[PDB]
Design a protein around this ligand. Structure first.
Ligand SMILES: *[B]([O])([O])[C]([C]N1[C]=C(C([O])=O)N=N1)[N]C(=O)[C]SC1=NN=C([N])S1
Length: 357
C-alpha cells in the first residue's frame, strides 16, 4: 500500500466520518511528512454553487490567524523595530501614561494583561473607539500573572507591530510576511479575483456565512488561506533554518515557550507541548478551563527539547486545526467550512499522525 493511499485511508478512517456526523459541507486535510505533501479534499466549498473543495479553496482560519500575528511580531522584534519589553504607548503614542501602558508587548501577545476577555465588544466599531477602549482600560489582576485567552490582547499586539513597521497590519502580512513564506493564496482581505475560490462558511444551522472582523480583530482571526499555503506554513515551521535571518528567527520566536499552564507551554501564538504528548494533553489545551477562564501561569519546569505545537481556530462558519512535530518532520492541517468540536479535530489529527508510517 503506497504511502499516499496509506495516508488517505487513515484520513478516511478518522476525518471523513466527521462530515456526516456534523453535516460538514466541505473539508480539506493535508499531511506533510519528510517534505512530501499529501492533500485530501472532501465535499463542497459552496453548497448553493455546487463548487467542490479543491486546492484553490480559501478558508477562514479563525484563531489560527494569531500564528501569523505572532510571526509578524517575531519578525519586527528581530529587525529591531520592537522589543517585547516595550509597552504599547511607545508606538501608539496616544496610550502613553495610561494603565495599559504598564503591560508589555510579550504580555499582550501571551494573554497576561490581567484584564482582557476573549472577545472585543461588537459595539467598538471604529478605530477611534478602539483607541478609547485602551485609554479607559484599567487593570484587574497582577499584570503578567494570569493567562486569559484574549482577542483584544493579541489584537493590540498586532496593531503595535504594524505601527513599528509603519504599515497597516494587513500590509504587514500581505506585503511582508506572506511573501517571505511564498504564501500566494493567503489573505487578510480576499481580492475580487479570488472571491470565486472563497468558501462559504456554514453556521450550526448550515446557513452560509462569512466573517466580518471588527477594527481590532484581523490579527486575532482575520486571515484566510488554502490547504497548500497552510502546508507551506507548516513546512516553514518545520524547517525555519532555510529562511533569511529575520524570518528564521521570527519563526523560532513563535516556538519559544514563555510559561506553562499545566502541560501546555504558551509560546508566541503557538501552543507548545512535550513530545510525545497524550491525546488528553492536547485536548486539555482546548478545555473550558484553559480557553474561557483565567489561569495562573507558572515557570516552565520541564523544558522539552523534543516538542510539538498546535493551534485550533474557529469562526462562526469555519473550523481549523494545525499541528506539527519537528523531530518527526511531520505536520497536519485540517480546514472545514463548518465549525466542529475542537476535541474532534484534535482526536482525528492525533489518530492520523500516530498511525502514519
Ligand atoms: B479563536 O478561534 O480561538 C477565537 C476564539 N474562539 C474559539 C472558538 C471555539 O472554541 O469554537 N470560537 N471562537 N475565534 C474567534 O474569536 C472568532 S468567532 C467569529 N466569527 N465571526 C465573527 N464576526 S466573530
Amino acid at each position: 500500500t503506497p504511502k499516499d493511499q496509506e495516508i488517505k485511508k487513515l484520513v478516511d478512517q478518522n476525518f471523513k466520518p466527521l462530515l456526516e456526523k456534523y453535516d460538514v459541507p466541505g473539508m480539506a486535510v493535508g499531511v506533510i511528512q519528510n517534505n512530501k505533501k499529501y492533500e485530501m479534499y472532501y465535499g463542497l466549498q459552496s453548497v448553493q454553487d455546487k463548487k467542490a473543495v479543491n486546492s484553490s479553496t480559501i478558508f477562514e482560519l479563525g484563531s489560527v490567524s494569531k500564528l501569523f500575528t505572532a510571526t509578524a511580531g517575531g519578525y519586527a522584534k528581530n529587525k529591531g523595530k520592537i522589543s517585547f519589553d516595550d509597552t504599547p504607548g511607545k508606538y501608539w503614542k496616544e496610550l502613553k501614561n495610561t494603565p495599559i501602558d504598564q503591560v508589555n508587548l510579550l504580555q499582550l501577545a501571551t494573554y497576561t494583561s490581567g484584564n482582557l476577555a476573549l472577545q472585543f465588544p461588537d459595539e467598538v466599531k471604529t478605530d477611534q473607539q478602539v483607541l478609547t477602549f485602551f485609554k479607559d482600560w484599567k487593570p484587574k489582576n497582577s499584570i503578567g500573572e494570569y493567562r486569559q485567552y484574549s482577542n483584544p490582547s493579541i489584537g493590540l499586539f498586532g496593531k503595535v507591530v504594524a505601527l513599528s513597521m509603519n504599515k497597516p497590519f494587513d500590509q504587514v502580512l500581505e506585503k511582508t510576511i506572506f511573501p517571505a513564506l511564498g504564501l500566494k493564496h493567503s489573505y487578510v482581505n480576499v481580492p475580487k479575483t479570488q472571491m470565486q475560490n472563497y468558501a462559504f462558511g456554514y453556521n450550526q444551522e448550515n446557513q452560509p456565512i462569512r466573517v466580518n472582523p471588527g477594527p481590532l480583530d484581523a490579527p486575532a482571526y482575520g486571515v484566510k488561506s488554502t490547504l497548500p499555503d497552510m502546508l507551506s506554513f507548516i513546512h516553514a515551521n518545520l524547517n525555519p533554518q532555510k529562511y533569511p535571518a529575520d524570518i528564521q528567527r521570527a519563526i523560532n520566536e513563535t516556538h519559544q515557550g514563555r510559561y506553562q499552564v499545566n502541560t501546555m507551554y504558551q509560546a508566541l501564538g503557538w501552543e507548545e507541548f512535550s513530545y510525545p504528548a497524550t491525546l488528553q494533553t492536547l485536548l486539555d489545551s482546548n478545555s473550558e478551563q484553559i480557553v474561557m477562564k483565567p489561569n495562573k501561569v507558572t515557570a516552565i519546569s520541564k523544558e522539552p527539547s523534543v516538542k510539538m505545537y498546535h493551534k485550533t481556530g474557529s469562526t462562526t462558519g469555519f473550523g481549523t486545526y494545525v499541528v506539527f512535530i519537528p523531530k518527526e518532520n511531520i505536520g497536519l492541517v485540517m480546514l472545514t467550512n463548518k465549525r466542529i468540536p475542537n476535541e474532534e479535530r484534535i482526536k482525528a489529527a492525533y489518530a492520523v499522525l500516530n498511525a502514519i508510517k
